[PDB]
Amino acid sequence: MPLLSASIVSAPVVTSETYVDIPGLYLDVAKAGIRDGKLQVILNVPTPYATGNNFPGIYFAIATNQGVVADGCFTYSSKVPESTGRMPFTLVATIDVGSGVTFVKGQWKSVRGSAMHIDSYASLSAIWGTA
Amino acid sequence: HMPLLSASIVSAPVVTSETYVDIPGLYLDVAKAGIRDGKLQVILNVPTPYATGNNFPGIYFAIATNQGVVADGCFTYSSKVPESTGRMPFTLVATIDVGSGVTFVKGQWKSVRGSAMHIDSYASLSAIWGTAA
Amino acid sequence: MPLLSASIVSAPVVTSETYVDIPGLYLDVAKAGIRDGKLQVILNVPTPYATGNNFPGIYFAIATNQGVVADGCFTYSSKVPESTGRMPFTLVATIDVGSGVTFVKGQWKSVRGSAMHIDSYASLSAIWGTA
Ligand SMILES: CC(=O)N[C@H]1[C@H](O[C@H]2[C@@H](O)[C@@H](CO)O[C@H](O[C@@H]3[C@H](O)[C@@H](O)[C@H](O)O[C@@H]3CO)[C@@H]2O)O[C@H](CO)[C@H](O)[C@@H]1O[C@@H]1O[C@H](CO)[C@H](O)[C@H](O)[C@H]1O[C@@H]1O[C@@H](C)[C@@H](O)[C@@H](O)[C@@H]1O
Ligand SMILES: CC(=O)N[C@H]1[C@H](O[C@H]2[C@@H](O)[C@@H](CO)O[C@H](O[C@@H]3[C@H](O)[C@@H](O)[C@H](O)O[C@@H]3CO)[C@@H]2O)O[C@H](CO)[C@H](O)[C@@H]1O[C@@H]1O[C@H](CO)[C@H](O)[C@H](O)[C@H]1O[C@@H]1O[C@@H](C)[C@@H](O)[C@@H](O)[C@@H]1O
Ligand SMILES: CC(=O)N[C@H]1[C@H](O[C@@H]2[C@@H](O)[C@@H](O)O[C@H](CO)[C@@H]2O)O[C@H](CO)[C@H](O)[C@@H]1O[C@@H]1O[C@H](CO)[C@H](O)[C@H](O)[C@H]1O[C@@H]1O[C@@H](C)[C@@H](O)[C@@H](O)[C@@H]1O
Ligand SMILES: Cc1nccn1-c1cccc(CN)c1
Ligand SMILES: Cc1nccn1-c1cccc(CN)c1
Ligand SMILES: Cc1nccn1-c1cccc(CN)c1
Ligand code: NA
């Protein structure tokens, strides 16, 4: 009954108009001998913030070796927030390992040129089951 | 042997409602899966919702079965009329007893103070089947 | 295939500089005969708010009998929010029970002297698995 988990405590701050991996949030599904069945994947980024001056925020995605499975974002409700507060983010998706999945990873990308910040615990977890 | 249930949507008609109404498509047919007993850990995941309105807007979300609401929570903005209605990620986790007579699990929502409710991207309802300790 | 769950509907409002238990968010792992393997733990506080006058917020942690496993926080984006809105918070961590884990619990602590509020459903859940 495999449980996969990866966690980080920081990432270099980057601005990106397109998805880039969150370094370290990666599960090697091949190395675990999972070749079929289903994975419930949670991307948990409980304390991120975004800096910028046009309604800042961050998109996050669960991706496999076949690309993005699901994505979401937080954004602030001010164009230039008084302070860039911590905006807890969770994304949950279920994947078919049998289609060719060798890995699951977290990615992120900028909302409107925002710099993306993780400076504390963030995780990527997966529970293996069947249909 | 180890079922994982999942349903996802990408949008819903924008509605205002003072009481819980189903989020269309966020439904798990538990009877169809032959789960008649045991426990379900259910996650309602609405990562990118927003609410529109003029009195501290927000949205309540619930996990419901055929026996009604199991658990609920809400997000709300911190301004009466937000400069822009930002995306407020929302997750709700609840564990249900299937053997009470649960045939289905669903997500519902309702307006905070007359807010219009918006999903325009990925949202999911997931469940892992288990047993008691 | 055990699923552990605990839920609450309120807690006395408190301010604390350091982690204190969220009363009622506790899983007795030993009492369930879980002695080894892995636990995917979810702390779900979907409708908390914080009151204060210095960028309010709340830190939340998953803790065992061996201390804090993972933690995160939300904060408002204003020094004195017009209204202290509901800021849904989820935290996910995976623990090794065989190290000496007898219980899992949720804890919280103040951001900048904030009073911490739960007045509706909050849960702590865990799925048991293996490496
Ligand atoms: C509250 C906060 O955001 N603290 C930040 C601080 O943010 C300031 C800026 O946003 C600034 C303008 O661009 O506005 C405020 O500052 C004004 C004034 O401009 C400032 O010079 C003065 O001293 O204070 C006033 C109001 O009191 C904001 O304070 O920016 C600094 C960067 O220089 C830090 O990021 C600070 O972050 C906090 O740093 C602490 C260490 O001193 C500590 O680690 C806190 O945990 C950390 O706060 C957390 O991260 C923030 C980014 C934010 O999410 C906050 O809610 C978190 O709690
Ligand atoms: C930032 C935002 O909310 N974008 C919305 C936009 O809202 C605009 C209004 O809030 C507006 C009121 O004057 O303020 C800004 O716009 C002004 C100006 O009025 C506008 O004409 C000019 O070009 O820009 C200035 C300031 O930059 C706000 O931008 O309403 C529009 C039109 O109806 C959209 O909803 C827009 O939503 C965004 O739309 C994008 C494509 O047009 C894209 O799809 C973005 O994802 C989407 O933004 C997201 O959803 C928003 C509702 C909000 O949650 C935001 O944080 C998200 O990123
Ligand atoms: C919008 C709100 O916060 N209502 C809240 C009120 O807040 C006011 C604020 O609007 C403005 O007037 O400034 C004052 C002074 O600081 C207050 O901050 O405070 C009241 C008590 O002091 C209540 O707490 C009131 O809370 C609402 O209460 C009604 C019943 O009267 C309902 O139960 C609402 O659910 C509840 O609103 C909910 O909680 C509040 C704290 C906030 O999170 C809302 O977004 C949320 O919907
Ligand atoms: C930003 C936005 N407006 C309407 C839909 N979306 C959106 C949000 C997150 C992800 C996606 C799909 N990549 C679209
Ligand atoms: C908004 C609020 N104030 C006190 C309690 N609540 C609340 C919030 C979400 C759900 C419920 C219970 N249906 C109550
Ligand atoms: C608040 C903050 N600034 C930088 C890092 N952190 C932070 C946030 C949540 C948890 C922890 C680790 N205790 C640190
Ligand atoms: Na692809």
Burial status of residue B62 (CB atoms within 10 A of its CB: 0-12, 13-18, 19 or more): buried
Show the tokens assigned to C92: 């996910």
The technique by which this structure was obtained is X-ray
For CA atoms B96, B102, B106, B108, the dihedral sign is negative
Contact B103, B31 (CB under 8 A): yes
Of the ligands numbered here, which is closest to the C-alpha atom of C56? 1
Number of domains in chain B: 1
Q: Distance between the two ends of chain B, CA-based, in angstroms? A: 18
Strands (E), B4-115: 4-9, 21-29, 39-46, 50-52, 58-65, 68-76, 90-97, 104-112
Longest dimension (CA), chain A: 49
List, in sequence order, the alpha helices (H) in B1-130. none
User: Which residue range(s) make up the domain with A53?
Assistant: 1-130
Long-range contacts of C11-16 (CB under 8 A, 24+ apart): C11/C116, C11/C118, C13/C115, C13/C116, C13/C117, C14/C115, C14/C116, C15/C110, C15/C113, C15/C114, C15/C115, C15/C116, C16/C108, C16/C109, C16/C110, C16/C116
> Which protein residue's CA is at the shortest distance from atom 3 of ligand 4?
B120
**B99 in reach of chain C (CB within 8 A):** no
First to last CA, chain A: 14
Q: Which of C73, C93, B47 is nearest to A7 (CA)?
A: C93
Can you tell me the distance from the alpha carbon of A41 to that of B123, in angstroms, rounded to the nearest whole number? 14
Contacts of A29 (CB under 8 A, 6+ apart): A4, A39, A97, A101, A102, A103, A104, A126
Instruction: Name the 3-class secondary structure at C108.
Output: strand
Dihedral sign for Cα atoms in the order C28, C126, C69, C57: negative
Cα C68 to ligand 2 centre (Å): 40
Burial class of C113 by CB neighbour count within 10 A (0 to 12, 13 to 18, 19+): middle
* Of C62, C80, C31, C122, the residue nearest B73 (C-alpha): C122
CB within 8 Å of chain B, chain C residues 3-22: 3-5, 7
Q: Which residues pair with A10 in a beta bridge?
A: none
Q: How far is CA B24 from CA A123, B27, C58, in A?
A: 30, 8, 33
CB contact under 8 A, C74 and A82: no
How many Å apart are CA B73 and CA B111, to the nearest integer? Answer: 12
Q: In a 10 Å sphere around its CB, with 0-12 CB exposed, 13-18 middle and 19+ buried, how is residue A67 labelled?
A: exposed
Sole residue written with tokens 């702390």: C43
As a whole number of angstroms, the distance between CA C110 and CA A16 comes to: 33
- Enumerate residues 6+ apart whose C-beta is below 8 A from C24: C6, C7, C8, C11
Tokens linked to A19? 């998805």
Phi, psi (degrees; rounded to nearest 5) at C92: -125, 130
User: Touching check for A96 and chain B: CB below 8 Å?
Assistant: no
Q: In this structure, are residues C120 and C6 in contact, taking their beta carbons and an 8 Å threshold?
A: no
Name the β-bridge partners of C101. Answer: none
Give the Å distances, CA to CA, from B26 to A49, A111, B9. Answer: 29, 27, 7
For B71, nearest residue in chain C (alpha carbons): C121
**Which of B50, B54, B87 to mutate to test binding with chain A, by most A CBs within 10 Å of its CB?**
B87
Q: Are B56 and B79 in contact (CB under 8 A)?
A: yes
Which of A38, A73, A131 comes nearest B87 by C-beta? A73
End-to-end CA distance of chain C: 15
Report chain B's C-alpha Rg in angstroms.
15
Tokens, residue A128: 């293996």
Half-sphere exposure of A78 (CA within 13 A, CB side): 16
Tokens matching residue B3:
């079922």
Q: Which residue of C has its CA nearest to B1?
A: C1
**Chain A residue with the nearest C-alpha to that of C80:** A82
Is the distance from CB of C121 to CB of B73 less than 8 angstroms?
A: yes
